[PDB]
Amino acid sequence: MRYGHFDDEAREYVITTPHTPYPWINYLGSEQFFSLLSHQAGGYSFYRDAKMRRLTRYRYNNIPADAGGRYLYVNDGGDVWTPSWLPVKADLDHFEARHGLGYSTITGERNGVRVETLFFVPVGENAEVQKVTVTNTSDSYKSLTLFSFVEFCLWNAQDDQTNYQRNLSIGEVEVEQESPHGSAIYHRTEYRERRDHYAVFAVNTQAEGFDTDRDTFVGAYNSLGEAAVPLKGESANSVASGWYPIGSHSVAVSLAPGESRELVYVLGYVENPDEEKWADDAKQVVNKERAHALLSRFATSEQTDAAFAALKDYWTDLLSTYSVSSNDEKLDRMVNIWNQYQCMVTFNMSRSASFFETGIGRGMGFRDSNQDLLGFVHLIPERARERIIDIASTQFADGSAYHQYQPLTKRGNNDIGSGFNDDPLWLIAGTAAYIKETGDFSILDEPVPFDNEPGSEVPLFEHLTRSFEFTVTHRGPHGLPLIGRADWNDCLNLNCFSTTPGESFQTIENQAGGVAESTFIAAQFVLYGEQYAELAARRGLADVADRARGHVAEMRDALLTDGWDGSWFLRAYDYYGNPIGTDAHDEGKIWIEPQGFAVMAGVGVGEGPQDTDAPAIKALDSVNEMLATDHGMVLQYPAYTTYQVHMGEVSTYPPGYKENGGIFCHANPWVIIAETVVGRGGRAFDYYKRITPAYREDISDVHRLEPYVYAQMIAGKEAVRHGEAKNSWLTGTAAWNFVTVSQYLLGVRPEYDGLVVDPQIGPDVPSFTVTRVARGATYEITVTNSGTDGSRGRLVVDGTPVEGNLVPYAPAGSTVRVDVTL
């Protein structure tokens, strides 16, 4: 199956039909106000946060899945149809949806009329802009009347979705048909309350009608695709007290054959200071200064078109700092465009919102973002520097770290689990990278506070220390670090033991005590121990850059003595000291995570890939023998047939699903560089094209999802719908896979002291040109691949031959030639 294709030259994914398997969406807006739009126009919009400021209403778990998005109702002499197809689901002459960078296009054609919409949230404007181009393709005349639809969300998801007792009575909105530039509306529910803000919906034509109550608009005994006003041929011009409010404007267009009209809408998170909140001393009308302007800069096609480019350039500039030329377009589009893109949504989304994220329970994770930053520091160091400090601030003076944080209020959340003992080291992982990208040792000296509590601020370095030493303090009799609530994945909870339903495994209570340990953590800390022992050293804290350096080794050395199976690494030593993931169990002998993660860190790594006396090698050989799937590497194997009380949420999952014998994309990219690390270039790549969606276009139907995005969860060999990927769009895999090709496969990877060129792509890719902007200097890396396992590139920089993996950092505005053969 296939439903579209990639148009690289245009930097976009094209879709043939609305009969996609599952709704495929794009993420609009990269700064403060993002919108989510299904190729069906289905989806919704929010400012900063969607838990709290959900501009508009979406309903998951819908029948059919996803009826309800931004819609245009069109009546052609009693004919009502929508190009979104949804909701009316009409017979279309032609249809197509193209995803873009910051935007998407929806175009629909029924009965001699063409409606095309441009969807985009443009830069600087906390508003989703829409540019319509209803064009008439008929010899005859078409005289149409157009209905625009939207369903506001009363600003708050948890309260809105779920709490109707207070909620149905607060829905007051204002109308202003005679607006300066056209005619609009202003959802202001709760504004009389503490709110000093609202949303604006408009069109740039004097609307000859409108509506602001849904039932009024659609009438009872009804569906969306059966909307009542669009069929009546005009608008009931409802006005709302209570219940659910929507925005609409009645518009008619008359167009000679081929004739056309342009219509621009403007949905905006409009907002005022408190003082100028009111147009009254009554305080009964909303200040509309800051919204008149809004719809004011977006009131022609010249401006809407003008904006379209602005961002195009925005992305267009944006992709430069890393790009590629090769034979494997499949590769190219994903690094170049679509993956570097998928990387971005995450920087901003954390894992808050997706179509699998109700984006209520989830703000931004400490762990998901620190790992998210890697994928992003190179997109925009400046923006990134802040996150480090925004995320670091959710740091306890304990060293212990807020599992996550509420995006909007920028404050810690205990809402979803607590006591995850690996978090603390993340800080170092993403952070240490900042500097590699920039050389900015400035951020260490920035002062970062503890828990957001003022007066506590310390240079960000203490946040690196605290977390480093959190482990050192917190480890088990094996010298192995403690798992607590969990290492990485939250499905491994040794200290839970629970038979009473109704309590999530992440909120559920965690029992005091243990001798319990994670080898996945120990692994990470052997990577990051050094991450900070060094940065601390360049600090001139030489005496404490060794202590730190030493604690890794006790730990380096205790991760082979005590976490080794002579074939693979132990998943963990559970609660009373017994192990987990030994060959000594029926189910779950091999767990992929210490495996990939302990080789990236370099543990048990020998002379070459030829040498098989290297635990590195034995360790990967096996995931190869055991975990590895054609679609990717299941988390561990085999999955469970019974509920391991002692472990936690892990076995709750049927076999083949998720953290239970499911392919956890995220876990996968960790192992690849292990292949590269190891020198098994050919293998890694095979892995990377394995869990990779560039190469996804093939069986769009196996996936049922977006062929352009790294989706956590592609179903397991054990499961019936294996090759079933869910939760696309918001997986650290976006950030961790870019990494690999960024830095380990295409081996263009930075350091504090120079740019390191070291490819390991297997023979599949024999030639490429990587251009990476570093420190202002462009590096043009033309490379010759011949594929020897354990082969390496020799560098010839600027015509002269050099030693190292390394290139000296070059003065800006300078352009530098690297040639490396391997």
Ligand X SMILES: OC[C@H]1O[C@@H](O[C@H]2[C@H](O)[C@@H](O)[C@H](O)O[C@@H]2CO)[C@H](O)[C@@H](O)[C@@H]1O
367 touches which of ligand X, its own copies, none (CB within 5 to 8 A by kind)?
Answer: ligand X
Q: Does residue 719 touch its own copies according to CB under 8 A?
A: yes
The reply on whether position 490 binds ligand X by CB under 6 A is yes
Q: Which is nearer to ligand X, 200 or 623 (CB)?
A: 623
Query: Per CB under 8 A, does 83 bind its own copies?
Result: no
Q: State how far the Cα of 634 lies from the Cα of 647, in Å rounded to an integer.
A: 18
Of the candidate spans 153-161, 256-264, 599-607, 748-756, the one that interacts with its own copies by CB under 8 A turns out to be 153-161
For residue 90, state whether it binds its own copies (rule: CB under 8 A). no
Residue 493 in the binding site for ligand X (CB under 6 A): no
In the window 162-201, what residues touch ligand X (CB under 6 A)? 165-166
| Closer residue to its own copies (CB): 507 or 821 | 507
Give the integer Cα–Cα distance in Å for 101 and 708: 12
Among 188, 367, 680, 703, binds ligand X (CB under 6 A): 367
Position 194 contacts its own copies (CB under 8 A):
yes
Chain-centre distance for alpha carbon 299: 32
Is 726 or 772 the residue whose CB approaches ligand X more closely? 726
**Strands of the sheet with 248-255, listed across from one edge:** 80-81, 71-76, 142-149, 248-255, 209-211
At 252, the amino acid letter reads A
Shortest distance, CB of residue 651 to its own copies, whole angstroms? 7
Residues 505-534 that bind ligand X (CB under 6 A): 506
Least distance from its own copies to the Cβ atom of residue 167, Å: 9
Near its own copies in 244-263, by CB under 8 A = 244
User: Does 164 interact with its own copies (rule: CB under 8 A)?
Assistant: yes
Which of 368, 422, 440, 490 is an active site residue? 490
Find which of ligand X, its own copies, none residue 721 binds, CB within 5 to 8 Å per kind. Answer: its own copies
Q: How far is the CB of 659 from ligand X (least distance, A)?
A: 5
Give dist(CA 187, CA 142) in Å, integer.
Answer: 33
Which entry of its own copies, ligand X, none binds 368, CB below 5 to 8 A by partner kind? ligand X
Strands (E), 227-380: 248-255, 263-271, 323-326, 364-365
Q: Token pair of 774, please?
A: 């570093």
**If residue 95 lies in a helix (H) or strand (E), which one and from where to where?**
strand 94-99
Instruction: Check residue 489 for interaction with ligand X (CB under 6 A).
Output: yes
Q: How far is the CB of 791 from ligand X (least distance, A)?
A: 33
Instruction: Find the binding residues for its own copies in span 493-512 (CB under 8 A).
Output: 498-502, 504
Q: Could you say which residues in the range 325-354 bind ligand X, by CB under 6 A? A: 351
Q: Whose structure tokens read 């998005």? A: 69
CB closer to its own copies, 52 vs 392: 52
Residue 201 and residue 112: Cα distance in Å, rounded? 29
Min dist. Cβ of residue 519 to ligand X (A): 15
**Residue 709, CA distances (Å) to 27, 37, 116, 143, 706 in order:** 11, 15, 25, 41, 6
The residue within the footprint of its own copies, chosen from 166, 566, 800, 813 (CB under 8 A), is 166
Tell me the two tokens of residue 268: 């905006």
Burial of 48 (0-12, 13-18, 19+ CB in 10 A): middle
By a kind-dependent CB cut-off of 5 to 8 A, residue 488 interacts, out of ligand X, its own copies, none, with ligand X
What minimum distance in Å lies between the beta carbon of 280 and its own copies? 10
Q: Among residues 342 and 651, whose Cβ is nearest to its own copies?
A: 651
- CB 404 to ligand X: min, Å: 8
Closer to its own copies at the Cβ: 197 or 792?
Answer: 197
Pick what 328 binds: its own copies, ligand X, none; C-beta below 5 to 8 Å, kind-dependent. none
Choice from 8, 116, 215, 457 touching its own copies (CB under 8 A): 215
Candidate list 175, 491, 620, 671; residue touching ligand X; CB under 6 A: 491
Least CB distance to its own copies at residue 44 (A): 13
> Would you call 490 a catalytic residue per the annotation?
yes
CB contact set of 727 (below 8 Å; sequence gap of 6+): 354, 356, 711, 712, 713
- Of 68 and 417, which CB lies nearer to ligand X in the complex structure? 417
Indicate the burial class of 280 (C-beta count within 10 angstroms; 0-12, 13-18, 19 or more): exposed
Does the bond joining 407 to the residue before it have cis omega, within 30 degrees of 0?
no
Q: Which of residues 403-422 bind ligand X (CB under 6 A)?
A: 416
Q: How many residues of this chain bind ligand X (CB under 6 A)?
A: 14
Nearest C-alpha neighbor of 370 from the set 356, 355, 351, 354: 351
CB of 499 to its own copies, least distance (A): 4
Token pair belonging to 110: 């029924």
- Residue 638 contacts its own copies per CB under 8 A: no
- Piece in contact with ligand X (CB under 6 A), picked from 3-11, 372-380, 486-494, 549-557: 486-494
Cα(62)–Cα(139) distance, integer angstroms: 40
Residue 763 binds what, of its own copies, ligand X, none (CB under 5 to 8 Å, by partner type)? Answer: none
Beta strand 33-38 pairing with 636-637: unpaired
Block residue for tokens 């993403």 = 430
Q: Residue 35 or residue 668: which is nearer to ligand X going by CB?
A: 668
| Residue in 559, 32, 602 with CA at minimum distance from that of residue 348 | 32
Q: Considering the rule CB under 8 A, would residue 241 count as an interface residue with its own copies?
A: yes
Rounded to whole angstroms, the Cα distance separating 366 from 467 reads 12
Of the candidate spans 6-14, 151-159, 592-600, 799-807, the one that interacts with its own copies by CB under 8 A turns out to be: 151-159
Q: Which does 314 bind (CB under 5 to 8 A by kind): its own copies, ligand X, none?
A: none
Partner interacting with residue 357 (select from its own copies, ligand X, none; CB below 5-8 Å by kind): its own copies
Task: Please work out the total of residues on this chain that contact its own copies, with binding judged by CB under 8 A.
Answer: 82
Cβ atoms within 10 Å, residue 464: 27
Query: Judged by CB under 8 A, which stretch of 179-187, 230-238, 352-360, 679-687 contacts its own copies?
Result: 352-360
In the range 757-816, which residues lie near ligand X by CB under 6 A?
none
Widest distance between CA atoms in the chain: 86
Asked if residues 401 and 464 have their Cβ atoms less than 8 Å apart, the reply is no
Instruction: Find the binding residues for its own copies in span 659-698 (CB under 8 A).
Output: 662
Give dist(CA 285, CA 748) in Å, integer.
58
Element of type H or E holding 527: helix 519-535
Give the nearest distance from C-beta 652 to ligand X in angstroms. 8
Q: How far is the CB of 738 from ligand X (least distance, A)?
A: 17
| Residue 489 interacts with, from its own copies, ligand X, none (CB under 5-8 Å by kind) | ligand X
Structure letter (DSSP) for residue 740: I
C-alpha distance across the termini of the chain, in Å = 38
Beta-strand runs (E) in 359-475: 364-365, 404-406, 411-413, 447-450, 453-459
Instruction: Report the phi/psi class of residue 258: left, alpha or beta, with left for phi > 0 and alpha for psi in -120 to 50.
Output: left
At position 46, the amino acid (one-letter code) is F
Q: What is the 3-state secondary structure (H, E, C) of 603-663?
A: CCCCCCCCCCCCHHHHHHHHHHHCCEECCEEECEECCCCCCCCCCCHHHHCCCCECCECCE
Q: Rule CB under 8 A: say whether 643 interacts with its own copies.
A: yes
Tokens of 321: 């700092």
Query: Which residues are known catalytic residues?
Result: 490
> Rule CB under 6 A: which residues touch ligand X?
165-166, 351, 365, 367-368, 416, 488-491, 506, 658-659
